[PDB]
Amino acid sequence: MEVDIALPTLSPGDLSALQRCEGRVVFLETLRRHATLREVALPCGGDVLAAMAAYRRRFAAVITRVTPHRMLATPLGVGGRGQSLVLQNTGPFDLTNGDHVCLVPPLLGDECLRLTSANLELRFPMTLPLAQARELTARVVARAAETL
């Protein structure tokens, strides 16, 4: 089960940068085999809580092979508990061995991928250890509760 993400014609100066994305996860709405890239899209920063809630309704998928034609991605978890794979560490902290990981939306809206070839940006989240994702979620929910 490997999903297929097709691409439009992009600039040769941007496939060289998108190809460097081989371990960041995307968030699809459905799990049909063939799929487009326009569907998986996210605006720039804003309302970290909204995205955090959206990270429960949609299920993740790790990408492993890029081609200027299509993109092969792996449905992360729906039915498998042993699919040993690799994903890059785009988190601020440093993760040792035997650490359960967690996807958290990026902060400040500073780090995104403005793709001008088709006018759409993809905000790949960051991967943190559980112990610090818990404190981050706690701080944000406390601050949200503070404002009545």
Binding site: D4, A6, R32, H34, A35, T36
Partner: protein, 49 residues
């Protein structure tokens, strides 16, 4: 004397509507059927569908 005008079904127009069959054992049959099978064509599609 008015002779009858013999008409046969094979010479009419409606012959081309139905195929007929001399089946002498018809009164012997229970519920009888016919069977069909068709295959609808399909067109390829360039689609993420």
């Amino acid at each position: 004397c008015s002779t009858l005008s013999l008409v046969r079904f094979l010479e009419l127009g409606l012959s081309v509507a139905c195929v007929c069959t001399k089946f002498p054992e018809l009164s012997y049959v229970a519920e009888g059927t016919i069977q069909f099978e068709v295959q609808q064509p399909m067109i390829a599609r360039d689609g993420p569908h």
